[PDB]
């Protein structure tokens, strides 16, 4: 849209009030021209035809309940964009400021969100399992991080490479949540998942076995469902990332935590410099070990804790 940049206000999925960057041109559009080539939010109007229509609003105030998912998809996209820019110096997912597009109100009772190869897609949920998925900052950041993975390492979506793929997304989803300081934790999707049940979440990085996922490589799922257990075997890596950052003792292996900033740097470097499309866990450990070495030195505590956390989850 060709118009004037402006700022609007509205309410997100959880009822919180926020400003959003909009563009005026007869109507007020969810078009943020302050970040790269733009952040554009579309309304799928309960269908599956994508992208739907660029969101247009008459007075630049977004307080209706129908608007809530849009507000949040637009804002958290802006937050994820800024995380990657300011913390890793990466401009959009392609590293060239490609425009970021999202569609909300996709389909009816749709209990998921995904990156489809060109844009973000968010369901509204059924009201029991999910509320509108763009309400979870980590959900948003997890899915946009898949777009960064596609442009960089190219992890294919199955088996161990697909599990690494999902873990990277949970890792960077979590670190965006800490960066925004938006009630942070190590769990995935607790702000939108099962609104009638307090304290639960889809997955846990700090204790994956709490929701059924493996937390050691000997426990790994070796079946064929879920593309080879891409959302299940990610707990092995999540657990490891959690030990690197927070530290802990896990199957008798003690790890000294080095913090989230270092975890992010070590994993951003492995992702963009040593991982390939078909990398497996073992290769991820090597990549991670090499990245810490590159950044902090071969005999640093940083290397010591990468190795100890892969050893605690059984990845050699
Ligand atoms: Ca309005
Ligand atoms: Ca949280
Ligand atoms: Ca979370
Ligand atoms: Ca819940
Ligand atoms: Zn994912």
CATH label of the domain that carries residue 224? 1.10.390.10
Query: How far does the centroid of ligand 1 lie from the alpha carbon of residue 189, in Å?
Result: 28
Ligand located closest to 183 CA? 2
Same domain, 134 and 173: no
The answer to whether position 10 is within a domain reads yes
Q: Is 187 annotated as a binding residue?
A: yes
Alpha-carbon span 20 to 5, nearest angstrom: 11
Q: How was this structure determined?
A: X-ray
Alpha-carbon span 283 to 275, nearest angstrom: 8
Q: Is 207 annotated as a binding residue?
A: no
Of residues 13, 93, 107, the one with CA closest to residue 52: 107
Query: How far does the centroid of ligand 4 lie from the alpha carbon of residue 130, in Å?
Result: 8
Ion ligand 5 neighbours (CB, 5 A) are 166, 169
Place of tokens 């290769």: 283
Same domain, 145 and 217: no
Helix axes 234-246, 260-269, angle to 10 degrees: 130
Strand partners, 121: 103, 114
Provide φ and ψ at 73, rounded to 5°.
-70, -40
- Of the three residues 134, 154, 174, the one that is the final residue of a domain is 154
Same domain, 139 and 160: no
Same domain, 190 and 302: yes
What's the token pair of residue 41?
């939010």
Question: Is residue 160 among the annotated active site residues?
Answer: no
Alpha-carbon span 221 to 239, nearest angstrom: 15
Of residues 133, 76, 87, 142, the one with CA closest to residue 115: 142
Q: Helices in the chain by DSSP H: which ranges?
A: 68-88, 137-151, 159-180, 226-229, 234-246, 260-269, 281-296, 301-312
Query: What's the distance, Cα to Cα, between the start and end of the chain in Å?
Result: 52
Same domain, 117 and 215: no
Q: Is 193 annotated as a binding residue?
A: yes
Domain span at 217: 155-315
Catalytic residue among 74, 88, 105, 143: 143
- Of the three residues 154, 179, 204, the one that is the final residue of a domain is 154
Burial of residue 63 (CB within 10 Å: 0-12, 13-18, 19+) is exposed
Burial of residue 9 (CB within 10 Å: 0-12, 13-18, 19+) is middle
Given in angstroms, what resolution was this structure solved at? 2.2
CATH number, domain at 148?
3.10.170.10
The answer to whether position 1 is within a domain reads no
What's the token pair of residue 183?
């009630």
Strand partners, 188: 203
- Of the three residues 125, 154, 183, the one that is the final residue of a domain is 154
- Which run of H or E residues covers position 204? strand 203-204
Query: How far does the centroid of ligand 3 lie from the alpha carbon of residue 240, in Å?
Result: 17
Ligand located closest to 173 CA? 3
Alpha-carbon span 75 to 69, nearest angstrom: 10
Question: Is residue 250 among the annotated active site residues?
Answer: no
Catalytic residue among 88, 231, 250, 302: 231
Strand partners, 24: 4, 28
Q: Is 37 annotated as a binding residue?
A: no
Q: Is 232 annotated as a binding residue?
A: no
Question: Domains in the chain: how many in total?
Answer: 2
DSSP state of 133: G
Left if phi > 0, otherwise alpha if psi is -120 to 50, otherwise beta: which for 123? beta
Q: Is 32 annotated as a binding residue?
A: no
Alpha-carbon span 118 to 154, nearest angstrom: 15
Query: How far does the centroid of ligand 1 lie from the alpha carbon of residue 113, in Å?
Result: 25
Query: How far does the centroid of ligand 2 lie from the alpha carbon of residue 188, in Å?
Result: 8
* 3-state SS assignment for residue 210: helix
Query: How far does the centroid of ligand 4 lie from the alpha carbon of residue 225, in Å?
Result: 25
Cis upstream peptide for 257 (omega within 30°): no
DSSP state of 273: I
What's the token pair of residue 262?
């270092």
């Amino acid at each position: 849209i060709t118009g004037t940049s402006t700022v609007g206000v509205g309410r997100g999925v959880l009822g919180d009030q926020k400003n959003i960057n909009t563009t005026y041109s007869t109507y007020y559009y969810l078009q943020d021209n302050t970040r790269g080539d733009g952040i554009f939010t579309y309304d799928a109007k309960y269908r599956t035809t994508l992208p739907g229509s660029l969101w247009a609003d008459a007075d630049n105030q977004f307080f209706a309940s129908y608007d809530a998912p849009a507000v949040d998809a637009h804002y958290y996209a802006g937050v994820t964009y800024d995380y990657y820019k300011n913390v890793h110096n990466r401009l959009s997912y392609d590293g060239n400021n490609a425009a970021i597009r999202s569609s909300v109100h996709y389909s009816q009772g749709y209990n998921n969100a995904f990156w489809n190869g060109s844009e973000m897609v968010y369901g509204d949920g059924d009201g029991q399992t999910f509320i509108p998925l763009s309400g979870g900052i980590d959900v948003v950041a997890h899915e946009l991080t898949h777009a960064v993975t596609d442009y960089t390492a190219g992890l294919i979506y199955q088996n161990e490479s697909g599990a690494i793929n999902e873990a990277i997304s949970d890792i960077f989803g979590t670190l965006v949540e800490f960066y925004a300081n938006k009630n942070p934790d190590w769990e995935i999707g607790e702000d939108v998942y099962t609104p009638g049940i307090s304290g639960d979440s889809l997955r846990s990085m700090s204790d994956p076995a709490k929701y059924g996922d493996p937390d050691h490589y000997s426990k790994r799922y070796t079946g064929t469902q879920d593309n080879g257990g891409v959302h299940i075997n990610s707990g092995i890596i999540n657990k490891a990332a959690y030990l690197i950052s927070q530290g802990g003792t896990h199957y008798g292996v003690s790890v000294v935590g080095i913090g989230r900033d270092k975890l992010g740097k070590i994993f951003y470097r492995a992702l963009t410099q040593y991982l390939t499309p078909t990398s497996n866990f073992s290769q991820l450990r090597a990549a991670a070990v090499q990245s810490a070495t590159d950044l902090y030195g071969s005999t640093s505590q940083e290397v010591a804790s990468v190795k100890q956390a892969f050893d605690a989850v059984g990845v050699k």
